[PDB]
Structure 1
């Protein structure tokens, strides 16, 4: 069983920059990867920006301490535009790029060739099939899903996804990596939505349906779930938070895999806004208007 020390993170976006941040903070040598030096540049600036916010509150007393913390972490995150140039000596690759299967498969098929023999490949994919992406390579026993949640620096959960071919050796290492990252790992078969989303997304859709059916206003449904179920955010607040686009995307997927299914029936209200570009907190408006 190998102990992850060098981690290559492919995708300097929302989920990837977060993943690079935690790994560096927790003592892993990291190489962040994205299509351009400009994009990379911006990502590290965001990782830095996120780090100081963590510094000035983890070291509110001693600013210098917080500075050191920031500089050291940021300094153990290198940046490259071609993952193939660094994976030959990395222990784990965590992929977090476009949620497109063809692109991923193309990515891994290539990396498969450069990466050392012990290197493990993990996809932070939210809706695709891990087993699929895994089959674009000849290294499935070393392939699995390592699903994090936004925002990564804060969310403590991480789902370790096991394809039928992933090996125990590979699994345990991914669990130990998760624990090393300071997160709490949990196991789940390679099934759509894994756990969190499989149980969360259908819930939100139902909320939109009760609203659409005119059974209650959004404001009252949100209140009801916050006060009567103890949820942090009402379903509509949560929808605007995770992104209407993101949701719509995932549900079209599940619907398309099984159209006769009523749980995945589309949503006019959701569709209109996705159309009107109102994506939620992202764009400054979703179901609710934001500053």
Structure 2
């Protein structure tokens, strides 16, 4: 009785949303990508194209026509719209990857709730909010789940599927199936702050910052230590810059707000200062380290 997700609406053409769209389309799903303006959408779809093209040139060297066909077919199955309500009437799944603001998300989902078909599942890619809070902005909590991806979406194979206590098993299973259909590996977590990955990763990153701040070791030695001592692909400072200092701070800020006594979520002066100076990591050319 569970739905097979075929037609997917992705809301938000940022890095995450565009990545989700790309992979869904690359795996035979029909995709409608939604954002605020045509200029934003054009840029998102262009980014998807370049990302697909890069892959194709490498993978289809011995068969360039197949490569071109793959890219073109994939892009073709990504439609765009600046009006979410107009596209969800018979979509199977909405995945929201927009600004991390409860009010904005709820306003979105409350509206979509009215226009989406009954069978439509709603999922949020949010890293900052409890799915439950967003789900209750609708009357379809049984069809509301967390579907949490990782940057870069076309590379990262994990998806966290998050049930609230109200999510149906049917909805959960549809999302597990959808995740596998994307070529990904779904794991399950309760609707708890940080789910699995961020819950275990982000506080560690904060601890690396705190160790540096105490004067105990250099950022460089800490990065080296984790790479050579723990086999991590990136040192925590490299990784902080890679995932975004603003992105990190915001998540920890949120955790700190809800649990101000918790040592793990104590703000970092160093992190705060970099974000205040708009040094956000790799994406601004400077975070803890300088890039160029």
TM-score range, shorter chain: over 0.9
Shift of 1:114: 0.3
Per-residue deviation, 1:127: 1.4
Consecutive aligned runs of 4 or more in structure 1 exceeding 6 Å deviation:
none
Give 3-state SS (helix, strand or coil) of 1:65's partner. Answer: helix
Give the Cα separation in 2 of the matches to 1:60 and 1:158.
30
1:156-197 residue CA offsets vs partner (Å, 9 max, x unmatched): 000000000000000000000000000000000000000000
SS at match of 1:282: helix
Distance 2:263 2:223 in 1: 23
Report the TM-score, using the length of structure 1 for normalisation.
Answer: 0.99
- Displacement after TM superposition at 1:149 (Å): 0.2
State the number of aligned residues: 291
Partner of 2:20: 19
Q: CA deviation at 1:240?
A: 0.5
Structure 1 position 58, deviation (Å): 1.5
Cα distance in 1 for residues equivalent to 2:60 and 2:104: 41
- CA shift at 1:6, angstroms? 0.4
What SS does the aligned partner of 1:89 have?
coil
Superposed counterparts of 1:150-229, under 5 Å:
150-229=151-230
Deviations 1:103-145 (A, max 9, x none): 0000000000000000000000011010000000000000000
Q: Distance in 1 between matches of 2:34 and 2:261?
A: 40
- CA deviation string 1:184-243 (max 9, x = no partner): 000000000000000000000000111000000000000000000000000000000000
Deviation at 1:20, TM superposition (A): 0.3
> Which residue in the other structure is 1:80 paired with?
81
Alignment partners' CA distance in 2, 1:139 and 1:180? 24
**Mapped partners of 2:90, 2:254: distance in 1:** 36
Distance in 2 (CA, whole Å) between partners of 1:266 and 1:73 is 43
**Offset, 1:57:** 1.4
How far does residue 60 in structure 1 lie from its aligned partner after superposition?
Answer: 1.8
Q: Which runs of 5+ in 1 are unaligned?
A: none
Identify the residue that residue 100 of structure 2 maps to in structure 1: 99
In structure 2, list runs of 5 or more residues that go unmatched: none
The whole-number CA distance in structure 1 between the counterparts of 2:29 and 2:264 is: 42
Deviation at 1:276, TM superposition (A): 1.0
- Tell me by how many angstroms 1:86 deviates: 1.1
SS in 2 for 1:98: coil
CA drift of 1:56 comes to 0.7
Displacement of 1:65 in angstroms is 1.3
